[PDB]
Design an enzyme around this catalytic site. Structure first.
Site, PDB file in Angstrom:
ATOM      1  N   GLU A  35       3.857   4.182 -16.042  1.00 35.08           N
ATOM      2  CA  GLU A  35       3.243   4.086 -14.724  1.00 35.08           C
ATOM      3  C   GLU A  35       1.786   3.621 -14.849  1.00 35.08           C
ATOM      4  O   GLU A  35       1.357   2.745 -14.101  1.00 35.08           O
ATOM      5  CB  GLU A  35       3.356   5.428 -14.003  1.00 35.08           C
ATOM      6  CG  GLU A  35       4.739   5.784 -13.493  1.00 35.08           C
ATOM      7  CD  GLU A  35       5.248   4.989 -12.309  1.00 35.08           C
ATOM      8  OE1 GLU A  35       4.580   3.984 -11.914  1.00 35.08           O
ATOM      9  OE2 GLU A  35       6.344   5.323 -11.838  1.00 35.08           O
ATOM     10  N   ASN A  46       1.946  -1.754  -3.642  1.00 32.28           N
ATOM     11  CA  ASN A  46       3.396  -1.841  -3.530  1.00 32.28           C
ATOM     12  C   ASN A  46       3.732  -2.981  -2.568  1.00 32.28           C
ATOM     13  O   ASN A  46       2.909  -3.331  -1.729  1.00 32.28           O
ATOM     14  CB  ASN A  46       3.966  -0.517  -3.020  1.00 32.28           C
ATOM     15  CG  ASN A  46       3.723   0.619  -3.990  1.00 32.28           C
ATOM     16  OD1 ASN A  46       3.194   1.674  -3.636  1.00 32.28           O
ATOM     17  ND2 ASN A  46       4.153   0.424  -5.221  1.00 32.28           N
ATOM     18  N   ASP A  48       5.315  -2.749   0.132  1.00 30.05           N
ATOM     19  CA  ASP A  48       5.304  -2.309   1.525  1.00 30.05           C
ATOM     20  C   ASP A  48       3.879  -2.189   2.065  1.00 30.05           C
ATOM     21  O   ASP A  48       3.696  -1.766   3.203  1.00 30.05           O
ATOM     22  CB  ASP A  48       6.091  -1.005   1.694  1.00 30.05           C
ATOM     23  CG  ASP A  48       5.483   0.234   1.074  1.00 30.05           C
ATOM     24  OD1 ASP A  48       4.489   0.089   0.390  1.00 30.05           O
ATOM     25  OD2 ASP A  48       6.090   1.336   1.198  1.00 30.05           O
ATOM     26  N   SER A  50       1.619  -0.084   0.733  1.00 26.70           N
ATOM     27  CA  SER A  50       1.090   1.169   0.225  1.00 26.70           C
ATOM     28  C   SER A  50       0.492   0.921  -1.163  1.00 26.70           C
ATOM     29  O   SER A  50       0.683  -0.148  -1.750  1.00 26.70           O
ATOM     30  CB  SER A  50       2.152   2.238   0.257  1.00 26.70           C
ATOM     31  OG  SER A  50       3.150   2.057  -0.717  1.00 26.70           O
ATOM     32  N   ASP A  52      -0.268   2.822  -5.157  1.00 21.72           N
ATOM     33  CA  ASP A  52      -0.007   3.938  -6.053  1.00 21.72           C
ATOM     34  C   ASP A  52      -1.267   4.241  -6.859  1.00 21.72           C
ATOM     35  O   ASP A  52      -1.930   3.311  -7.306  1.00 21.72           O
ATOM     36  CB  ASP A  52       1.063   3.566  -7.080  1.00 21.72           C
ATOM     37  CG  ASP A  52       2.478   3.361  -6.560  1.00 21.72           C
ATOM     38  OD1 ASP A  52       2.793   3.759  -5.430  1.00 21.72           O
ATOM     39  OD2 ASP A  52       3.269   2.877  -7.353  1.00 21.72           O
ATOM     40  N   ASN A  59       2.010   7.624  -4.501  1.00 20.56           N
ATOM     41  CA  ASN A  59       2.020   6.601  -3.465  1.00 20.56           C
ATOM     42  C   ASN A  59       1.392   7.100  -2.162  1.00 20.56           C
ATOM     43  O   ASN A  59       1.641   8.251  -1.763  1.00 20.56           O
ATOM     44  CB  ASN A  59       3.473   6.202  -3.187  1.00 20.56           C
ATOM     45  CG  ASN A  59       3.595   5.053  -2.220  1.00 20.56           C
ATOM     46  OD1 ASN A  59       3.916   5.255  -1.060  1.00 20.56           O
ATOM     47  ND2 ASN A  59       3.347   3.847  -2.696  1.00 20.56           N
TER      48      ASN A  59
HETATM   49 NA    NA Z   1       4.282   1.417 -11.660  1.00 20.17          NA
END
Ligand code: NA
Ligand SMILES: [Cl-]
Ligand SMILES: [Cl-]
Ligand SMILES: [Cl-]
Ligand SMILES: [Cl-]
Ligand SMILES: [Cl-]
Ligand SMILES: [Cl-]
Ligand SMILES: [Cl-]
Ligand SMILES: [Cl-]
Ligand SMILES: [Cl-]
Ligand SMILES: [Cl-]
Ligand SMILES: [Cl-]
Ligand code: NA
Length: 129
Positions: A35, A46, A48, A50, A52, A59
Site C-alpha cells: 500500500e 483513487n 472515484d 477519493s 488514500d 480512503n
Molecule cells: Na494502493
C-alpha cells in the site's frame, strides 16, 4: 517517516494487530508494504476522486475527512492528514474499525491481490517480536 520492516512489525504488534480479527501480523506488514512502501506520508488518488492516506492507505470516501471528497463519510472521525503522522496510532485504530466491517482485510485491494493466499509469515521473518 519510512519504517523499517521489523520496526513496523513491532509497532503494529504493540498496538495489538497481531491476530486481530484472525489476521496474523504478516498480513498487516504485507499490506503496508504494497500500500505505502512503509511510508507514513504516502497519498494516492483513487478513480472515484477519493484519496488514500498513510501507511495503510485509508480512503477518504468512507473513513477520514479531507475536505474534498463529495458525499463521503468520516467513520473514523479523523482528518485524513492525521493518518500521515510518524505515530501510526490513528492509522491502526482506524484499520481496526475497517477490518471489523464485514469484509475483513479484503477492504485493502492490495492485500487481496498481493498478500492473500501467499506466505505472509515471510514479512516478519527475522524480526525480534
Ligand atoms: Na494502493
Ligand atoms: Cl527494521
Ligand atoms: Cl521490505
Ligand atoms: Cl492469519
Ligand atoms: Cl504472520
Ligand atoms: Cl495519485
Ligand atoms: Cl475539512
Ligand atoms: Cl469531504
Ligand atoms: Cl485539491
Ligand atoms: Cl461520517
Ligand atoms: Cl508508532
Ligand atoms: Cl475475516
Ligand atoms: Na470523507
Amino acid at each position: 517517516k519510512v519504517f523499517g520492516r521489523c520496526e513496523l512489525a513491532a509497532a503494529m504488534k504493540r498496538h495489538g494487530l497481531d491476530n486481530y480479527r484472525g489476521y496474523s501480523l504478516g498480513n498487516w506488514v504485507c499490506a503496508a508494504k504494497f500500500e505505502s512502501n512503509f511510508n507514513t506520508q504516502a497519498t494516492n488518488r483513487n478513480t472515484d476522486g477519493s484519496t488514500d492516506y498513510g501507511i495503510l492507505q485509508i480512503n477518504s470516501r468512507w473513513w477520514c475527512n479531507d475536505g474534498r471528497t463529495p458525499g463521503s463519510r468520516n467513520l473514523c472521525n479523523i482528518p485524513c492528514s492525521a493518518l500521515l503522522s510518524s505515530d501510526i496510532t490513528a492509522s491502526v485504530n482506524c484499520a481496526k474499525k475497517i477490518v471489523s466491517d464485514g469484509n475483513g482485510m479484503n477492504a485493502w485491494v492490495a492485500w487481496r491481490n498481493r498478500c492473500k493466499g501467499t506466505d505472509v509469515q515471510a514479512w516478519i521473518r527475522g524480526c525480534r517480536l
